[PDB]
Amino acid sequence: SIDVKYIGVKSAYVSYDVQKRTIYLNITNTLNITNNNYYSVEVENITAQVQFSKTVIGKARLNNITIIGPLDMKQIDYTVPTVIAEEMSYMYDFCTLISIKVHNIVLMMQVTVTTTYFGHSEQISQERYQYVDCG
Amino acid sequence: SIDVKYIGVKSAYVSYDVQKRTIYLNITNTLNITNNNYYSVEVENITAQVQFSKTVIGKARLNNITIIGPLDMKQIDYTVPTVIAEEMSYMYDFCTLISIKVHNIVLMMQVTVTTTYFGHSEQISQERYQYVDCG
Amino acid sequence: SIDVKYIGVKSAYVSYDVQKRTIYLNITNTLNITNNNYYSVEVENITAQVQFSKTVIGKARLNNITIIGPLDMKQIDYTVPTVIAEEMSYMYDFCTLISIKVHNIVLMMQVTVTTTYFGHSEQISQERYQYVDCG
């Protein structure tokens, strides 16, 4: 990939930005741009390509075979009891979080037992992230 | 990929923006642009392509064979009991959250037992994310 | 990859930006730009390519065979009990967080038992991240 950008506030090719309480006076601005972009990208020129898979089983004897793909999750436990007991008392809770297995982004690609792949594969994340703000 | 951008506030090719309480006077702005973009992208030129899969089973004996794909989840347990007991007391809760297995974006592509693939695959995420904000 | 940039605030090719309480007077700005970009990227020129897979089982005897892919999670336990006991007392909680297995970005590509791959694979992450902010 090409030209992958995170810009926090402002993007220009040419900028003349005049901001705050300023005097901007008698200004002559002249601009003469030639800006051409030529892309030959992710391009393929092939006579033959072959993706061949063969399984042969002859006079074989097969017992108790297990094939298990990735991210097998077995007998996982989360135990998060919360207890408040009060007498003659005050609780003030502000912005209190209990957070279990919270996800923002999950991107999964070609997650398999078996893969035969030819060509291009791509993942991009661009992000402003804030979990907690309070005040 | 090409030209993948995250811009926080403003994007322009040429910008003459004037913001606040400013004086802009007698200004002469002149602009002459040539800006051409030429794209030959993800182009394919192929004479032959073959995706062959063959399974042959002769006088074989097969018993107890298990093929399990990815992300298999078994007997997972979440226990999150919340208990509040109060007498002659005061509870003030503001912005209190209990969050279990919360997802924003889940993208899954080519998640399989077996795969034969030729070409292009792509995942893009662009995001402004705030989980909690309070005051 | 090419031209992957993280810019915290402002991006320009040319900038004439005027900020705060300034006097900008009689300025003559003249600009002549020639800026052409030529990209021949991720380009392929091949006569033959072969992805061949063959499995042959003869007069063989197979028993108790287990094949397990990556990220296998078994009997994981999270125990996070929170207990507050109060009598004749005051509790003030501000911005209190309990966070268990919280994920932002999860990018997974080609996670497999077996893989045959030809070509390009790419992962890009650009991020402004704040977990907690409070006052």
Residue numbers in the entry:
A (entry chain B), B (entry chain C), C (entry chain A): 120 to 254
From the paper:
We also determined the structures of filaments comprising two protofilaments of fold I, related by C2 symmetry. In all three folds, residues G177–N183 adopt a conserved conformation, with the positively charged residues K178 and R180 pointing outwards. In filaments made of two protofilaments with fold I, two pairs of these residues are on opposite sides of a contiguous extra density that runs along the helical symmetry axis. As the cofactor responsible for this density probably does not obey the imposed helical symmetry, the map in this region is of insufficient quality to allow its identification. In fold I, this region packs loosely against the other side of the C-terminal hairpin-like region with the formation of three large amphipathic cavities. Individuals with fold I were homozygous for T185 or S185, or heterozygous, indicating that fold I can accommodate a threonine or a serine at position 185. Filaments with fold I were more common than filaments with folds II or III.
